Amino acid sequence: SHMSRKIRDLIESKRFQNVITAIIVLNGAVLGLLTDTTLSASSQNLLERVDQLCLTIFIVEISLKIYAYGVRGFFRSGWNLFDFVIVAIALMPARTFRIFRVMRLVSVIPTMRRVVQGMLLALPGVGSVAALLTVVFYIAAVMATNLYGATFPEWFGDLSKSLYTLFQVMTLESWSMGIVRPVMNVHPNAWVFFIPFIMLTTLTVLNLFIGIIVDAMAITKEQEEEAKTGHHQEPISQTLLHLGDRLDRIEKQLAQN
Amino acid sequence: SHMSRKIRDLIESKRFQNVITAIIVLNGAVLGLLTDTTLSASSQNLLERVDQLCLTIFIVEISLKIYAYGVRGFFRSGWNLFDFVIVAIALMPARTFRIFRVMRLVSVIPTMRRVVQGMLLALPGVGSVAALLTVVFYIAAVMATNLYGATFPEWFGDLSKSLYTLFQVMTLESWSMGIVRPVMNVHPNAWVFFIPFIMLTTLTVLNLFIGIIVDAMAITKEQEEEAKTGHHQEPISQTLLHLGDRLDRIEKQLAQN
Amino acid sequence: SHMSRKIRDLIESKRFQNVITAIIVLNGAVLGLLTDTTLSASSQNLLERVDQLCLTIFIVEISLKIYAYGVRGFFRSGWNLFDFVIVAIALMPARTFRIFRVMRLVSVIPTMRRVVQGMLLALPGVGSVAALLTVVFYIAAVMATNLYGATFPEWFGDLSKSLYTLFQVMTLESWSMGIVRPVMNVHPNAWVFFIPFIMLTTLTVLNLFIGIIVDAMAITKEQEEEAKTGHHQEPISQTLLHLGDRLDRIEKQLAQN
Amino acid sequence: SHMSRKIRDLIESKRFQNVITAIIVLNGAVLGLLTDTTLSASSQNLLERVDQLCLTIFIVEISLKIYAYGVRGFFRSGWNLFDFVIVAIALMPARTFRIFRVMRLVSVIPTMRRVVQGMLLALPGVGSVAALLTVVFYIAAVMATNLYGATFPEWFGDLSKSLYTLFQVMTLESWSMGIVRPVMNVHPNAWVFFIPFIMLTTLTVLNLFIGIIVDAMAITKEQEEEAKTGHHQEPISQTLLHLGDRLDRIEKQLAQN
Ligand SMILES: C=C(C)[C@H]1CCC(C)C[C@@H]1c1c(O)cc(CCCCC)cc1O
Ligand SMILES: C=C(C)[C@H]1CCC(C)C[C@@H]1c1c(O)cc(CCCCC)cc1O
Ligand SMILES: C=C(C)[C@H]1CCC(C)C[C@@H]1c1c(O)cc(CCCCC)cc1O
Ligand SMILES: C=C(C)[C@H]1CCC(C)C[C@@H]1c1c(O)cc(CCCCC)cc1O
Ligand code: NA
Ligand code: NA
Ligand code: NA
Secondary structure, three states: OHHHHHHHHHHOOHHHHHHHHHHHHHHHHHHHHOOOOOOOHHHHHHHHHHHHHHHHHHHHHHHHHHHHOOHHHHOOOHHHHHHHHHHHHOOOOOOOOHHHHHHHHHHHOHHHHHHHHHHHHHOHHHHHHHHHHHHHHHHHHHHHHHHHOOOOHHHHOOHHHHHHHHHHHHOOOOHHHHHHHHHHOOOOOOHHHHHHHHHHHHHHHHHHHHHHHHHHHHHHHHHHHHHHHOOOOOOHHHHHHHHHHHHHHHHHHHHOO | OHHHHHHHHHHOOHHHHHHHHHHHHHHHHHHHHOOOOOOOHHHHHHHHHHHHHHHHHHHHHHHHHHHHOOHHHHOOOHHHHHHHHHHHHOOOOOOOOHHHHHHHHHHHOHHHHHHHHHHHHHOHHHHHHHHHHHHHHHHHHHHHHHHHOOOOHHHHOOHHHHHHHHHHHHOOOOHHHHHHHHHHOOOOOOHHHHHHHHHHHHHHHHHHHHHHHHHHHHHHHHHHHHHHHOOOOOOHHHHHHHHHHHHHHHHHHHHOO | OHHHHHHHHHHOOHHHHHHHHHHHHHHHHHHHHOOOOOOOHHHHHHHHHHHHHHHHHHHHHHHHHHHHOOHHHHOOOHHHHHHHHHHHHOOOOOOOOHHHHHHHHHHHOHHHHHHHHHHHHHOHHHHHHHHHHHHHHHHHHHHHHHHHOOOOHHHHOOHHHHHHHHHHHHOOOOHHHHHHHHHHOOOOOOHHHHHHHHHHHHHHHHHHHHHHHHHHHHHHHHHHHHHHHOOOOOOHHHHHHHHHHHHHHHHHHHHOO | OHHHHHHHHHHOOHHHHHHHHHHHHHHHHHHHHOOOOOOOHHHHHHHHHHHHHHHHHHHHHHHHHHHHOOHHHHOOOHHHHHHHHHHHHOOOOOOOOHHHHHHHHHHHOHHHHHHHHHHHHHOHHHHHHHHHHHHHHHHHHHHHHHHHOOOOHHHHOOHHHHHHHHHHHHOOOOHHHHHHHHHHOOOOOOHHHHHHHHHHHHHHHHHHHHHHHHHHHHHHHHHHHHHHHOOOOOOHHHHHHHHHHHHHHHHHHHHOO
């Protein structure tokens, strides 16, 4: 099929990506201008028409891809499905957050798409650290609700309220002037609860963050190498393994020969 | 003993771990529901019955382990002793924090158990940094108590009070608007005390945290490798040492042969 | 040209750099003294005369460089152009920030100039992470303006106002006591907006910062090596590549010979 | 001299260090107890007598060292001079901070002494980053004093006041609710000043901190190795250099032989 192959090659061109990137930027600029509550009716109609035009250009773009690659081939990519959901949601009249269309900058620009991929692929490796943090938060929230809920109902009156103020305490935001000094006026030993909670959760959150950053950076760096040269660099352990194999080949020809 | 070996293999199965994991989750969910002060008497009785059931299932689980492995073999593991303490404490009627039973998720799930092990084994390596921080805190607290205790008794009136507000100052929480600008109204040179205290303690705490995270991550990564393949990767220094040994063997067969 | 070569060698001397460094420090000290609103008219005239003298010394210094290196040779350096802009701006009477002349300490001291160079050369490598953060900020600001602008106009009444309070929220500054608890009094589910915003942006900002620091440190370390020894250290991958080439040369002389 | 050699070996024993460590701890405990303003006269006299005893034990300890090693040999160590200054300052009656005697725990315990040594030896390597931060702070303080000093004299009325509130702003402490939103009520564009100041200084401070931590950890790790085994591990570049030398020796015996 020469027509399908001319469309797929048009889609894959740098100028097609640049034109779609320009329409995403324009659509996001009119949605940002539409937040201004002082616009005239004519200005609002005008900007809403550019939003309706921007959306239809994405509809033509997506339909072109579903014909050039096929339904099976298009929906086999997570980024094509993501783009399809964003544009198909707009054809649902009864949602209300059109600005999420600017996320398509991530899916459309490959260098930005590799940053997200690296962050997503790094998440499984830190799953046990995230589960440990989740476990500490849950136990702390139950303890805080039972200990301080009757005396401090706005902050600890229920599990949800305790989870919220423990997240604020973990971020160090007014943890002492705002929360723990007011609580110690009633419960003088409360520092025994909150100070170890802060020590354990700030250490665990920083471990979770560093674990993601280190892995994500190395994954994205490997993905960038593959996109440019077709392959990525081999690990230092594999480089030293191939040297050992070459050393054993030389050793074999020294005892025999 | 075929009975003991059938029980130990039942205990070590993935489905036994999955059922115990489900009971820990259920027990934690009813303890969290029991924080709600608006429940009916019947709902409270109902949830308290699920807690009593969850506890007895853990009693059967632990007793099965003490019979399949033996008293010496069971108590030779730090994680078995930890599980035993958590369940045996519940049989002590006169404590009040049943939610600590959710910590058994760490001991029961091996990937979570290796995160904790890595963090614990990393603590000795940062002991001198933690002692240095402790020494700075103690000296600062004595200085702050003597300098500001009479003028600012709520924050520095005693050693305990000074330790608490120096921990708040180290976390940067309202250190200036809340503490040091009010103190400089009376003691204009107080910034000479508090600014170097913040510089030294935030640097030392970050060193302590990074030291733990780096070591803990590498230890847990080695422990994960041993659990899957039976062995961990050798250090790069040991890889280069074995190459030098192979180089000397080739060198020996070049001068002689 | 012996005169041009004697001037260029005078300019390149350590004592010329030390004298210019002293004049930048003196100029910055008089500009700092000139901030004091309690000075006498004579003291102000005196300090303003030292500023006019300091500026003319820089004019002689720059003119000497433009004659010893030539217009093409001088303006071929980004640091010479930067120095020229700083001193030429002062000859524009109608701007108002003479203290920017102290930035010349960075351009004049080579070790400080290499720290900046390392930070600047690290920026392209983190461009996709910075663009991702920018995209999240923009989407969040539009969402916050539409959701909270009518109820909270001081913080979210317009796009600019929302960008500002989201930057404050990302820095964790009074995010809960100051912004999100007041907003949840009207919109109880606002935590669904702000807590994921904080999680995503603090992770992304830390990734952006670490990415810059790691690259900048390695670039500056390579630039320092080149300035002292004429060359920098080769990467470990290139060291292992040259060993493989030497291994293949030994392998060639083992099968043939 | 058998007497001098028996004293030096007594001084260098683990039990002498343990006894001096116990006296430093005891001295610090009585100085902390002496902060309590509710003690009786007899309790104060009692604790002050233990402080006078603790000091004299350090005087005997230091005098023993000056006789066993000699004046030249003792004062040739930075840690011996540091210990001498701390104890000799106490014999100066006219200062007031005896708690600084607890710093001797760092000088007396070798593992703690190596943490400090690693941090001190790391400082020269980050000197250009610290100078860059200092330069940004100075320029910002002059700009802030001239821009906001007349309208906001408590925070920016003078250079010293501006340096203080810029350090608070850099630590993110109430930077917006406390400082920049009150300043933007008068100067609406002030965010153009403060937001880039925060971006640049938090990045630079984190670079300064990471640079210290990374170097200090590696230096202390090398110093610990030398103290235990007499030598430290060689760098990976030097390990690969010795392999290249062995490769050239094998290459020499392949073409000739
Ligand atoms: C100074 C503070 C508050 C920081 C920096 C130091 C440490 C060790 C950790 C702190 C931290 C938090 O406490 C919370 C969050 C948000 C985490 C959202 C996902 C769970 C990020 C974060 O870096
Ligand atoms: C921005 C802040 C406050 C952070 C991030 C930057 C640095 C350098 C250090 C700061 C910090 C603290 O000051 C205190 C704690 C709790 C330590 C509990 C165990 C001793 C964690 C923490 O990361
Ligand atoms: C405890 C806080 C606030 C810190 C430390 C922990 C994390 C993960 C991130 C936080 C952070 C911010 O949220 C914002 C800025 C300024 C960024 C300006 C350029 C975009 C620096 C910064 O380190
Ligand atoms: C969340 C905050 C405030 C932290 C963590 C994130 C960053 C990037 C930097 C911040 C920071 C400061 O702004 C100031 C200090 C004290 C420095 C004293 C010596 C100059 C330590 C510090 O870690
Ligand atoms: Na903070
Ligand atoms: Na705060
Ligand atoms: Na605050």
